[PDB]
Ligand binder design. Structure first.
Ligand SMILES: [Mg+2]
Ligand SMILES: [Mg+2]
Ligand SMILES: [Mg+2]
Ligand SMILES: [Mg+2]
Ligand SMILES: [Mg+2]
Ligand SMILES: [Mg+2]
Ligand SMILES: [Mg+2]
Ligand SMILES: [Mg+2]
Ligand SMILES: [Mg+2]
Ligand SMILES: [Mg+2]
Ligand SMILES: [Mg+2]
Ligand SMILES: [Mg+2]
Ligand SMILES: [Mg+2]
Ligand SMILES: [Mg+2]
Ligand SMILES: [Mg+2]
Ligand SMILES: [Mg+2]
Ligand SMILES: [Mg+2]
Ligand SMILES: [Mg+2]
Ligand SMILES: [Mg+2]
Ligand SMILES: [Mg+2]
Ligand SMILES: [Mg+2]
Ligand SMILES: [Mg+2]
Ligand SMILES: [Mg+2]
Ligand SMILES: [Mg+2]
Ligand SMILES: [Mg+2]
Ligand SMILES: [Mg+2]
Ligand SMILES: [Mg+2]
Ligand SMILES: [Mg+2]
Ligand SMILES: [Mg+2]
Ligand SMILES: [Mg+2]
Ligand SMILES: [Mg+2]
Ligand SMILES: [Mg+2]
Ligand SMILES: [Mg+2]
Ligand SMILES: [Mg+2]
Ligand SMILES: [Mg+2]
Ligand SMILES: [Mg+2]
Ligand SMILES: [Mg+2]
Ligand SMILES: [Mg+2]
Ligand SMILES: [Mg+2]
Ligand SMILES: [Mg+2]
Ligand SMILES: [Mg+2]
Ligand SMILES: [Mg+2]
Ligand SMILES: [Mg+2]
Ligand SMILES: [Mg+2]
Ligand SMILES: [Mg+2]
Ligand SMILES: [Mg+2]
Ligand SMILES: [Mg+2]
Ligand SMILES: [Mg+2]
Ligand SMILES: [Mg+2]
Ligand SMILES: [Mg+2]
Ligand SMILES: [Mg+2]
Ligand SMILES: [Mg+2]
Ligand SMILES: [Mg+2]
Ligand SMILES: [Mg+2]
Ligand SMILES: [Mg+2]
Ligand SMILES: [Mg+2]
Ligand SMILES: [Mg+2]
Ligand SMILES: [Mg+2]
Ligand SMILES: [Mg+2]
Ligand SMILES: [Mg+2]
Ligand SMILES: [Mg+2]
Ligand SMILES: [Mg+2]
Ligand SMILES: [Mg+2]
Ligand SMILES: [Mg+2]
Ligand SMILES: [Mg+2]
Ligand SMILES: [Mg+2]
Ligand SMILES: [Mg+2]
Ligand SMILES: [Mg+2]
Ligand SMILES: [Mg+2]
Ligand SMILES: [Mg+2]
Ligand SMILES: [Mg+2]
Ligand SMILES: [Mg+2]
Ligand SMILES: [Mg+2]
Ligand SMILES: [Mg+2]
Ligand SMILES: [Mg+2]
Ligand SMILES: [Mg+2]
Ligand SMILES: [Mg+2]
Ligand SMILES: [Mg+2]
Ligand SMILES: [Mg+2]
Ligand SMILES: [Mg+2]
Ligand SMILES: [Mg+2]
Ligand SMILES: [Mg+2]
Ligand SMILES: [Mg+2]
Ligand SMILES: [Mg+2]
Ligand SMILES: [Mg+2]
Ligand SMILES: [Mg+2]
Ligand SMILES: [Mg+2]
Ligand SMILES: [Mg+2]
Ligand SMILES: [Mg+2]
Ligand SMILES: [Mg+2]
Ligand SMILES: [Mg+2]
Ligand SMILES: [Mg+2]
Ligand SMILES: [Mg+2]
Ligand SMILES: [Mg+2]
Ligand SMILES: [Mg+2]
Ligand SMILES: [Mg+2]
Ligand SMILES: [Mg+2]
Ligand SMILES: [Mg+2]
Ligand SMILES: [Mg+2]
Ligand SMILES: [Mg+2]
Ligand SMILES: [Mg+2]
Ligand SMILES: [Mg+2]
Ligand SMILES: [Mg+2]
Ligand SMILES: [Mg+2]
Ligand SMILES: [Mg+2]
Ligand SMILES: [Mg+2]
Ligand SMILES: [Mg+2]
Ligand SMILES: [Mg+2]
Ligand SMILES: [Mg+2]
Ligand SMILES: [Mg+2]
Ligand SMILES: [Mg+2]
Ligand SMILES: [Mg+2]
Lengths: 117, 122, 52, 204, 137
RNA sequence: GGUGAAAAGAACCCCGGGAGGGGAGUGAAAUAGAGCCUGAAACCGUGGGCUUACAAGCAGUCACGGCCCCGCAAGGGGUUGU
RNA sequence: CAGUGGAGGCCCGAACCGGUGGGGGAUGCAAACCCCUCGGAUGAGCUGGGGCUAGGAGUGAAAAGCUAACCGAGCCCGGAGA
RNA sequence: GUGCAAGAGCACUCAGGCGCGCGGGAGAACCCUCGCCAAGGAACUCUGCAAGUUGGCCCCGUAACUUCGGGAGAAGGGGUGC
RNA sequence: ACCGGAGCGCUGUCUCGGCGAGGGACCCGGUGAAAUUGAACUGGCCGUGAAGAUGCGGCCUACCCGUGGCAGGACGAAAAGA
RNA sequence: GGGGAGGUUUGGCACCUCGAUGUCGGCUCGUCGCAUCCUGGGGCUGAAGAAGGUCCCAAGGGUUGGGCUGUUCGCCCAUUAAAGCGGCACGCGAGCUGGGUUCAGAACGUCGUGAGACAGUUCGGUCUCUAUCCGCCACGGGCGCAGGAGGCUUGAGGGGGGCUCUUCCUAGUACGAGAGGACCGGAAGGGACGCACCUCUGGUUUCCCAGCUGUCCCUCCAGGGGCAUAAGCUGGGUAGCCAUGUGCGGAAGGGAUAACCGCUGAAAGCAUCUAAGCGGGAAGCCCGCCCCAAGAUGAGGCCUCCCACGGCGUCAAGCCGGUAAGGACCCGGGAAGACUACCCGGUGGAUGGGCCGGGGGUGUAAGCGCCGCGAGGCGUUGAGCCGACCGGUCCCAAUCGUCCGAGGUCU
């Protein structure tokens, strides 16, 4: 209802955003991250924009991406190592595949987020 | 949309300064009255020795409203206050020389008098 | 403990009946390309990994 | 008894002589008649127009043996338009001259489990003075020992909208035979991209 | 069909292209086709544009002036067969898209708030009086 | 409150992290295996027989009929369609 | 008159004391709570510790209020199987 | 600690300490706590209940009445940043 | 923070509702209550009956089982009517 | 003076209910009756016309907003077509309310020596999260429908809707001394209500964009983050959802009738609408329009697609298997949605996510340069950022696969 819109959320906004943010910091720091499918299917398109944003170079975009990740060094790494690999590729900088094991005694389904390669 | 407890600015010189609506004289229960609609009102304040006294129950006609009027031509008009001109029971304006704009709607409703005196029909 | 309450002990019958839609259905498994292993489709499943 | 299938494409307004007109645009692609229903074989008379162009692949059905049985490039949908038998092999906007009045059928947007307030424009409680847990409630639903039951049809909340809605008698404005468009008086059910069917009214 | 919107846009030939760009927060005189008794004058209307409301076709705008000590706003369809021609008549430093805020200031403070867009003025009197000569020879 | 005559209180192997079990073993008996004699009823379950998705109900009773079961048959038992 | 002075069951307002209005809670977080609001806040003030007063009795700025979560006469055991 | 006229107030924050011992999804009605709303502006209603408006400091200014202290923060205004 | 009447300001109190946020409700995994309960195979109407019927009569209707919802009945629960 | 109907008043009786059937008024939601307030149809009129009066027929729909009182009721204001009356436990407190009344506090009048008392007043005064069955709203699972399957449908039976005013032409004509002022037929514009809808207008739009305060941080400046809600505040806002906004609806028409008006016509030479027979005649009845609908077990119809036996039962019903058409799973999703269901897509693919373009919002980013002691200003610049919409593009993900599904009984 009125869902006639688009894009999900559990947690509240101050929190929801912080979530995405941290989930990226991790993904960029760890290249691979396990997390619940929804949590993931969402975080997916968040990094893409930050990857594609690093595919550019101007400090505007550095500073821009600096907004969501707060760690200079990790953005350094974002622009210096991570972005290159993704030239000539347009979108899809990221993958998620669902794992077959559920979390225990909360029975959450899981899945995999991956810096695509 | 003018309605029952609403105050209207008085647009003529009948010596009334404000009437509040009292009843709108569309059908047997119209929810609101707009430009070119005649309502019953009560004079809530009235210039010293006018024709009309505070407390006089009167007929008047909505010449300007604060809620925009749509025109079939697809445009709209809105004024910074609500205003009416007190008119006769037979429907002629009780004052003379009304002032401040007015809606063309007034014309098509049979109120030429007022629009004639109107210093600018918008 | 209050306002609305059950008017009669529901019966073994009536009870078990409501229960009729309770039974679960078994998982959906499929063999993988890799092992003879069994997977929920569209998953990955350990001891088998994956390509690409 | 004209009729053609279409899709609510969208709406805007356009200017006639010298006033704005709220119009909704139906695209009513050339509907291939696909069967006809006689008073003899069927017992009633009408005509089965198809609509969207279909992949001969997904038509793997026994559906092929219908389109085939009338040599019609497979469509996506096809509804009958009762009591109206045309000619040629397809019906097109051309059945409609501007100024003809039509009834468009559509499928109302779906509001899901609806409040009695939204479903019936019910009053509901007072935002203020009294209680606070009946704000949007229907309130009383009955009497006492007699009847001692609720009437069928009682307005109550629940799944509302997303249903067959016919809005009678809109005016056809300029029909664009070119791009297959059909212009109307706006008030036509369902969302954009929905199947709809237009017909001659009942004015006289 | 995947056109969807392109088809709405086709529905538009009613597009007019003669009227000039005008930013909100600067005065315009719009000459409007008016039905008087049963004739057609062209009532003018000259105020600050308060709100352009983009939607391509059926984008619209409003202008607000004080007719006889009373304020007035008029809403205009930007492509109305009823606008004769819209005479621009002053360019202003808006600093903000929708600017109804001016409603409760209405006076001189408006003036101190809506300076003249010197930039865009320079643009016009330039490439206008400057394209006058390119027409001649 | 109550294993058993006696602790003979179940070595040892097997599945399990354990619990608990399956074998092996003791005992006259282990559904006497350790809050363990006997072990009723409510109550929960597994298997089987008859039965039930156009039907109206203090749930039974009377009749006929079908099915299943015990008996060679005459008979009886279970079920329940009308 | 000005200065100085720094009174007050004085004013505004936290702590602290309290419970005005509304909402919430009503098998509650809670056998009296929560939120917003509100009253006092140098006084007839609030408060720790040590003491004394009790059942037709005490205590009571007085409501028959309080006297160990129900007080127009406490709780317990007894007369009592009134 | 910093800021706000002041402060044990308020916002953020050291030190220190916590995320309140069920989670995961979805994004219906309805309930709770909260935000905003065209025109109107008490017509609501037992009652403006509730919400809202107002709000600190600085200057201007301030009525009946009075027990001469009051009424007074009357009212109504203007200023406030860099 | 007494109770009544009036006005100004302001407002979702109302005309007359709409959208949005979150905590529940809903769905999946863990844990898992309660009052109540003659037994139940528990429909509508008009009768009737201890004078207000799912349970008598007559007629009408009605495939089996649930889930989210609403409160008209079960003279619903509660308390051996104040 | 007389006879009745009703069961809305005041009562009488004391029959169920004192191991409890919560009371007045309001709100919310109504639904029935007709003894009709309006609108429709008519008879008489002391009916010229217009307006009325009285009676008949007719529930289809409608039946306003305020002032005062807890009030119902009533008076009053302003309207209206009209502001109908009753039933439903004086309908409705496991729906709200709690102003009224009948707990404890307090006071006045009053009675009583008194304690206290008073259908006398007056101020205060705890209204209980969880629905088992029936009923109701909505939504599924099962099986059924004598072959299986895909699609399209008939409409038995239900349901929704049903109001009404004003001005104009007819015509200032009929009627009337005048004042007044029609039938009939036609047009236009409204009120309220209903269903859809977002183009417009107007809302919201919780992070789409901007600005601003305090503070704490990154990194000193710049620049930026957290927090000040569960958005810190403010200005503004797409899609979606919406009304204040937009469209449409009430019919027309056919049929049968009510009161009533008649044609012909006896009985009863005439007379009569009637007893045989026939015509007209209502906003009402049946149709018609809209929606549901074959569990219509009385399970309908059409078009189409798939099709014998491979082994036991001696005729007979079956039983077990791999299959057919076809279907299901699982997945990507959806103006579809509580769940389920529904619908689309699943690499032969644009379904979602990105990326791109557009639409749209904000309103000139940063950095650098330039002017100014400075706060700032100006240029680069309609820049920068940029959800949802209209598209595009296989970059990512819908991988791969599994299961089920007839072999069609008898005259
Ligand atoms: Mg989407
Ligand atoms: Mg003039
Ligand atoms: Mg003039
Ligand atoms: Mg002049
Ligand atoms: Mg059982
Ligand atoms: Mg398909
Ligand atoms: Mg309301
Ligand atoms: Mg309450
Ligand atoms: Mg409650
Ligand atoms: Mg009944
Ligand atoms: Mg726009
Ligand atoms: Mg031992
Ligand atoms: Mg062992
Ligand atoms: Mg050994
Ligand atoms: Mg361990
Ligand atoms: Mg052990
Ligand atoms: Mg033995
Ligand atoms: Mg034994
Ligand atoms: Mg043991
Ligand atoms: Mg034991
Ligand atoms: Mg036993
Ligand atoms: Mg057997
Ligand atoms: Mg049967
Ligand atoms: Mg047997
Ligand atoms: Mg002092
Ligand atoms: Mg003091
Ligand atoms: Mg004080
Ligand atoms: Mg203290
Ligand atoms: Mg106290
Ligand atoms: Mg109190
Ligand atoms: Mg409660
Ligand atoms: Mg002391
Ligand atoms: Mg005592
Ligand atoms: Mg005791
Ligand atoms: Mg004795
Ligand atoms: Mg906890
Ligand atoms: Mg605002
Ligand atoms: Mg408002
Ligand atoms: Mg406003
Ligand atoms: Mg406003
Ligand atoms: Mg009102
Ligand atoms: Mg009152
Ligand atoms: Mg208040
Ligand atoms: Mg304020
Ligand atoms: Mg005062
Ligand atoms: Mg400062
Ligand atoms: Mg008793
Ligand atoms: Mg009475
Ligand atoms: Mg007796
Ligand atoms: Mg009882
Ligand atoms: Mg009871
Ligand atoms: Mg009761
Ligand atoms: Mg009572
Ligand atoms: Mg008459
Ligand atoms: Mg007459
Ligand atoms: Mg007459
Ligand atoms: Mg009659
Ligand atoms: Mg009658
Ligand atoms: Mg009726
Ligand atoms: Mg009625
Ligand atoms: Mg009705
Ligand atoms: Mg009142
Ligand atoms: Mg009275
Ligand atoms: Mg009634
Ligand atoms: Mg009652
Ligand atoms: Mg009740
Ligand atoms: Mg009540
Ligand atoms: Mg009371
Ligand atoms: Mg109260
Ligand atoms: Mg009172
Ligand atoms: Mg009292
Ligand atoms: Mg009392
Ligand atoms: Mg008495
Ligand atoms: Mg009182
Ligand atoms: Mg009080
Ligand atoms: Mg109550
Ligand atoms: Mg209360
Ligand atoms: Mg609750
Ligand atoms: Mg009806
Ligand atoms: Mg009709
Ligand atoms: Mg004339
Ligand atoms: Mg005359
Ligand atoms: Mg809009
Ligand atoms: Mg706005
Ligand atoms: Mg929007
Ligand atoms: Mg932002
Ligand atoms: Mg800095
Ligand atoms: Mg800089
Ligand atoms: Mg931080
Ligand atoms: Mg922090
Ligand atoms: Mg904002
Ligand atoms: Mg509306
Ligand atoms: Mg004769
Ligand atoms: Mg005759
Ligand atoms: Mg039947
Ligand atoms: Mg074959
Ligand atoms: Mg063969
Ligand atoms: Mg195959
Ligand atoms: Mg196949
Ligand atoms: Mg499928
Ligand atoms: Mg395929
Ligand atoms: Mg391809
Ligand atoms: Mg795409
Ligand atoms: Mg610039
Ligand atoms: Mg600049
Ligand atoms: Mg810049
Ligand atoms: Mg440089
Ligand atoms: Mg831009
Ligand atoms: Mg860009
Ligand atoms: Mg490509
Ligand atoms: Mg392609
Ligand atoms: Mg099989």
């Amino acid at each position: 209802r009125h869902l006639k819109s688009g894009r999900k959320l559990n947690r509240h906004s101050s929190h929801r955003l912080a979530l995405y943010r941290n989930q990226a910091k991790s993904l960029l720091t760890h290249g691979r991250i396990t997390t619940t499918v929804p949590k993931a299917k969402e975080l997916r398109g968040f990094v893409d924009h930050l990857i594609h944003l690093a595919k550019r170079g101007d400090l505007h975009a550095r500073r821009l991406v600096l907004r969501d990740l707060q760690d200079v060094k990790l953005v350094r790494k974002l622009f210096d190592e991570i972005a290159p690999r993704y030239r000539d590729r347009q979108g899809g900088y990221t993958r998620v595949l669902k794992l077959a094991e559920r979390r225990r005694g909360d029975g959450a389904p899981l899945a995999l987020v991956e810096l695509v390669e | 949309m003018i309605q029952p407890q609403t105050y209207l600015e008085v647009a003529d010189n009948t010596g009334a300064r404000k009437i509040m609506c009292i009843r709108v004289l569309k059908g047997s229960n119209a929810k609101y009255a707009t430009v070119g609609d005649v309502i019953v009102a009560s004079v809530k304040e009235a210039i010293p020795r006018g024709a009309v006294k505070e407390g006089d129950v009167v007929k008047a006609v909505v010449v300007r409203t604060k809620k925009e009027v749509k025109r079939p031509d697809g445009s709209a008009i809105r004024f910074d206050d609500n205003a009416a001109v007190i008119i006769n029971n037979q429907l002629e304006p009780r004052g003379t020389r009304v002032f401040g704009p007015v809606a063309r709607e007034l014309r098509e409703k049979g109120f030429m008098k007022i629009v004639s005196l109107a210093p600018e029909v918008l | 403990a209050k306002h609305p309450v059950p008017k009669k002990k529901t019966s073994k019958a009536r009870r078990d009946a409501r229960r009729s839609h309770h039974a679960l259905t078994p998982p959906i498994l499929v063999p993988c390309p890799e092992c003879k292993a069994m997977k929920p489709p569209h998953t990955v499943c350990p001891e088998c990994g994956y390509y690409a | 008894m004209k009729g053609i299938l279409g899709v609510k494409v969208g709406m805007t307004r356009i200017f006639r002589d010298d006033r704005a007109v709220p119009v909704t645009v139906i695209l009513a692609g050339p509907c291939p008649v696909v069967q006809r229903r006689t008073p003899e074989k069927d017992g009633y008379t009408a005509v089965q127009l198809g609509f969207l162009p279909q992949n001969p692949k997904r038509v793997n059905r026994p559906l092929k043996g219908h389109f085939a049985k009338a040599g019609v490039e497979p469509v996506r949908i096809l509804r009958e338009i009762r009591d109206f038998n045309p000619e040629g092999d397809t019906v097109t906007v051309e059945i409609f001259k501007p100024g003809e009045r039509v009834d468009v059928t559509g499928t109302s947007k779906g509001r899901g489990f609806a409040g009695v307030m939204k479903r019936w424009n019910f009053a509901g409680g007072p935002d203020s003075h009294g209680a606070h847990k009946i704000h949007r409630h229907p309130g009383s639903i009955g009497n006492r020992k007699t009847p001692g039951r609720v009437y069928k049809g009682k307005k109550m909340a629940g799944h509302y909208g997303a249903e067959r809605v016919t809005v009678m008698n809109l005016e056809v404005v300029d029909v664009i035979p070119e791009e297959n468009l059909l212009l109307v008086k706006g008030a036509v059910p369902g969302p954009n991209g929905g199947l709809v069917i237009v017909r001659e009214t009942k004015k006289a | 069909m995947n056109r969807g919107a392109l088809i709405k846009l086709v529905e538009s030939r009613y597009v007019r292209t003669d009227l000039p760009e005008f930013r909100p927060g600067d005065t315009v005189r719009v000459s409007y086709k008016v039905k008087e008794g049963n004739r057609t004058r062209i009532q003018d209307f000259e105020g600050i544009v308060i709100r352009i409301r983009r939607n391509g076709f059926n984008t619209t705008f409003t202008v607000r002036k004080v007719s006889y000590g009373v304020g007035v706003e008029r809403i205009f369809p930007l492509h109305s067969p009823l606008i004769q021609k819209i005479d621009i008549v002053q360019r202003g430093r808006a600093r903000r898209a929708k600017l109804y805020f001016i409603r409760n200031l209405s006076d001189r403070e408006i003036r101190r708030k809506l300076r003249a867009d010197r930039k865009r003025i320079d643009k016009d009197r330039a490439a206008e009086r400057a394209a006058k000569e390119e027409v001649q020879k």
